[PDB]
Every structure is written in C-alpha cells, then in structure tokens.
C-alpha cells in the first residue's frame, strides 16, 4: 500500500565518498578501487571560471596539490590525469568499502537516486530523472560538485552522474563517470540555457498504472485512443512522443491491471485536456513524470 | 539551489537490518549492540492476527524459536522478552556496524527518513512525516514490518519508527522503538479508521519560505494577517491552528528571507482561498507539509 518518489539504500554510495582539495576549492570525489574521481573545475578558482583552459591549468598542478580526504584520514595521490570534464586521482590505497560498481550513461527519462554530499560527507538522498533536456532538477549548493547520481542491481552500484553545475535557471547539469556533459553544457561560468522541458510520457503513464494499483482510479475512462491520435495531444502539451518501443516497456503494468495501454492513454489525454478539478493522483496534483515503468514494477512488488 | 524532498543518507541503518523468523512469519529487525528489535507479531500466523494473546503466543516461544540472520550470517538468541508491541532478542554478538544511536517518541508534524527493508535487505528510502492523525503515508508491503524510520544528527541515529500495520485506508500504522504505538491503533486486524487527517501548517509555512530562498515568489502578496484571524482561514481548511510556538521556530526563516510570519501566513491564507490557479511552487501543485522548519533550513544550507 501506499506509492512514494523513493530513493536506492545510499549505503554502497557513502562508503566512496572523499573530499578533494585544491588550492582553496574544496569539492567532493568519488573513491572506487585506487582512483578518486572529480570535476576537473576542482583546479580553478572563481575567477578562472570565466574562461578555463584546463590543460593549461592542470601543468601548473602536482600529485602533492590534490588533498584527498576519506573521512578522517589522508590519502596518497600517486598519479593524476583529465579525462573528459573530470579528474582521475590515482593513490596508493584501494578503497576497501569499494562496492561492485559499473559506470554507465543514461538516457533521457530514466531515473537515479542522488547522495548529495559537501566536503566529502553525505548530506542526504533523493530520487532524480534525466530530464529530455539533459538537465536535473536537483537540490545542489556551491560545494555539492562531485555529488554522484546512481542506480542498484542487488550488490551492483551503476554510477551514471556527476554533479558539476547549477545554470542561471536553477536546474542542474553534469557529466557520466566518464567525464561527458549530459546534453550541451560546458563546466565554464558563462551563461547556457536549457532547452525546453517536455515530460516524460512513458514515466506518467506507469505513475497512472502505480495509481491504478495503489486505488486512486478515478481517472480511468471509458475511452480509447491511437498512438498518433494521443501523440497529436502530447505534442500540444509538451510531452514527449510515445512509441512501440514505450507501449511494450509497460506490457508489465498492462498485464499486471489489464488496462490496455492505449486505453490509459486515452485516460491520459482527457487528463492533459481536463485537469485534475482539484483533485489528487497518489496524493500529488500534476502529472508525475520521474517514475520510470521499473521503477513502477520494483516498488510495487518489494525488490531488494 | 533546488529544493527537493530529501531524506538522510541510510548507511548507518542499513548496517543494524536483519531478517527475523518465527514459525512460518518473516520480517524485519534492528540489531543495535546486541539486542535485535522487531514487531511483536513475528509470532502469530496470519489467522492468530484476528484477535491475538500476544502474551499467550509467547509462551510457545523459546530462544531457538527466533531466527535472526544478519546478511547471510546466523545470530544466536540468547534472551528474548516484549516491551509493549515489539520483541527484544538478546543475542550473543554485539552489531559491530551499531552507530551512535538514541530511542525517541516523535510528535506530530515532525518528518523523518524510512528505510523500506524486505527479508532483512533495505529496498529503499523516503521521507515521512508523522501525520496529525498518527498515520504516516508510507509506501509498505507484506514483508516490509519492522522497518524503521530515523533522523540523524551528524553521527547519532535517533530511531523514531518501527513498521507495524497497514490500515484499510492504505495509510500505516507502527510504533516507537519502546514498542508503543503512534495514536490509538493496535496489533490486530480489526478494522481500525484514521481520524481527520490535517495540513501541517508550520511545515507550509516553511515549505513556502524555502520557495522564496529558490526564486518561486508569486505567491508573495501586499497582505499581512493576525494569528487568530489566520486561524479562522486554517480552521476551516483543515490546517493545524498555527501558535506562537510555530511563529517562534519559524524566526530563523523569517530573519533570512525578511518576510515577517504573519506576512507569510497572509500570503497562505490566500492560496487557501484562490488554490493556485493552475500555477505550480517548487515543482508542487499542492501546499507541502512534509518539510518541517529544520528541514528547510538543513537543506538551504548543506548540514553533513
Ligand atoms: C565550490 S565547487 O567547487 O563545488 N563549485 C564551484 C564552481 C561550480 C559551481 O558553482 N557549481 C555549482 C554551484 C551550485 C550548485 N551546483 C553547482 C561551477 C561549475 C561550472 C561552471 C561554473 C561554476
Ligand atoms: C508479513 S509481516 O510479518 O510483515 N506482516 C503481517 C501482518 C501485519 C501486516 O500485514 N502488515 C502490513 C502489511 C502491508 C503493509 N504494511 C504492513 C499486520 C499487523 C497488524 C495487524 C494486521 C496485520
């Protein structure tokens, strides 16, 4: 009973986090084996944000210049080497809380829990989507950079993000664990706007089939629809459009409520064109759309 | 900058999860140093929870009886007693992952992180509130009693839940770790109703001033009001009366934003009687109330 924005045990997650130093910028790594992974802006001051040239940059630093600090205690940095838009700190000491890890790059409308951390502590958990236009919408203050985003396969942590930036609109980007900016952003202190932020269509529907399970079914219609008829009202509502590739990733949810997916569409639609009238969908009164059809499918049958 | 509903980093639990059985019943419990701490109903069967003699079922019981295995390593029960609802096994080994923790009965309207557990593994984590009616709106399946709810201040874990019950309505029910229920519910499938279940009005309060820290400022009007007056508003919208307890705890926000309470309330009071006009706050179409004060503060100013 019940449906809630839930976030992966952060556990695995706490036990990689260091704080990187260098000169007076002060972030967070990411400890896993010998390396320690960062954003490479740790190398700048404020005013080399203008405009950076890491390269340049990063001659003019040594191993002894990068201060890792797990917890308490020092680590030794033996080697160290840009990759992308993040720094690779290699050291001389595994790390032993080092969980099975795999680093992978997400798609846009997939979903990831964050641990939000500053000066290399945690400071909470929450659940993200990779928005359609590469932005997060997160909750990220100067010092949060180096922050991970991340999924769980039962004793499998899947880095997929690194947090590097807030825009001037206060959303949210950064890279792969890889080093590459999600969508178009630079890490530079010049201004770059977001593209437009449709929803996530897919994500709604399997939220409507969590609702459907959960009891709240007063959306359900006696209607139908076609895929290029509700993709002519996701158009006009900014959301994205839905394909074979969507209705088959809710076959699950389908089966599992035997409500057809062009029939929740079309329950869909009438929402998109009506408005909730004041009322409530798992006690939230818009279109959830940060819920991917797993996600529906993992917290509704208890996965550890 | 963001604002997102956050809960604490779930380490420290993680590590005090365990897997209880008696008989053919399975579910949670908390190792702290060496006593494990579970819902007293691990001892009934599904047809002894109509009416149970929780202290007559005991009596049936003996240490090798209950089944504690931490991971995928057997504890050895050595003592084992009730407390109100919930069992204490002595066991012979101290959790040597036990943090620095405290046993606290919280109040109505304060928040706090549930790590959702199934057969001893956390599945996951999110942010609750005690409602006024004693309920928490949680997300819990069969299997999922004995999880806990918690706060954490740096390194202290207080434990303020543990999972019991699911009522009819789909809301839950459970306890402190002294076994004592929240509200008036008992451990028996009887059918049990919620009373009214009513908005939080401090924790909007502060909801709306972490808003104006993050640029959504609309909602700020010409208006100021009186706390009975203001009352009248939250009475019949059934919102908690606001007193000057809640204008004292919510001074730190007020003095950061310079929004005087009664100001704020005065700009809450005419989202109560306008709604929102289609318009959104912080990513919400409805008032939230499950930020309290401290929260919004912690997350506006990055506590580790
Ligand atoms: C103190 S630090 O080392 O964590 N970051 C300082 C620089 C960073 C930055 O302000 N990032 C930031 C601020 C607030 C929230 N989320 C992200 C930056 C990166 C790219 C272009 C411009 C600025
Ligand atoms: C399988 S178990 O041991 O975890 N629980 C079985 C009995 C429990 C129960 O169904 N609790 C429950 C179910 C679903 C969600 N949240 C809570 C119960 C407790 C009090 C009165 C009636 C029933």
Redesign the interface.
Same mark, same amino acid.
């Given at each position: 009973? +019940?449906?809630?924005?839930?976030?992966?045990?952060? +556990?695995?997650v706490?036990?990689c986090m260091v704080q990187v130093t260098c000169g007076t910028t002060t972030l967070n790594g990411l400890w896993l084996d010998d390396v320690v992974y960062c954003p490479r802006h740790v190398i700048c001051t404020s005013e080399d944000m203008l405009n950076p040239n890491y390269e340049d940059l990063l001659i003019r630093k040594s191993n002894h210049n990068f201060l890792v600090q797990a917890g308490n205690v020092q680590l030794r940095v033996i080697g160290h080497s840009m990759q992308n838009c993040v720094l690779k700190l290699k050291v001389d000491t595994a790390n032993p809380k080092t969980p099975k890890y795999k680093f992978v790059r997400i798609q846009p409308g997939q979903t990831f829990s964050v641990?939000? &951390?500053?000066?290399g502590?945690?400071?909470?958990?929450?659940q993200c989507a990779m928005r359609p236009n590469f932005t997060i919408?997160?909750?990220?203050?100067n +010092?949060?950079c180096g922050s991970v985003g991340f999924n769980i396969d039962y004793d499998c942590v899947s880095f997929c993000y690194m947090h590097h930036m807030?825009l001037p609109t206060?959303?949210?980007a950064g890279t792969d664990l890889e080093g590459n900016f999600y969508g178009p952003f630079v890490d530079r202190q010049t201004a770059q706007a977001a593209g437009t932020d449709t929803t996530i269509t897919v994500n709604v529907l399997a939220w409507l089939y969590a609702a459907v399970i959960?009891?709240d079914r007063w959306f359900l219609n006696r209607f139908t629809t076609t895929l290029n008829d509700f993709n002519l009202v996701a158009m006009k509502y900014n959301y994205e459009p839905l394909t074979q590739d969507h209705v088959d990733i809710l076959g699950p949810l389908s089966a599992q409520t035997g409500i057809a997916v062009l029939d929740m569409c079309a329950s869909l639609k009438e929402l998109l064109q009506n408005?909730?009238n +004041?009322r !409530?969908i798992l006690?939230?009164?818009?279109l959830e759309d940060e819920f991917t059809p797993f996600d529906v499918v993992?917290? &509704?049958?208890?996965? !550890?």
């Open positions: 009973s +019940g449906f809630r924005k839930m976030a992966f045990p952060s +556990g695995k706490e036990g641990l939000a &951390c500053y000066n502590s945690p400071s909470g958990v929450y919408k997160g909750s990220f203050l +010092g949060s807030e206060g959303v949210h959960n009891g408005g909730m +004041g !409530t006690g939230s009164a818009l993992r917290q &509704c049958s208890g996965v !550890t």
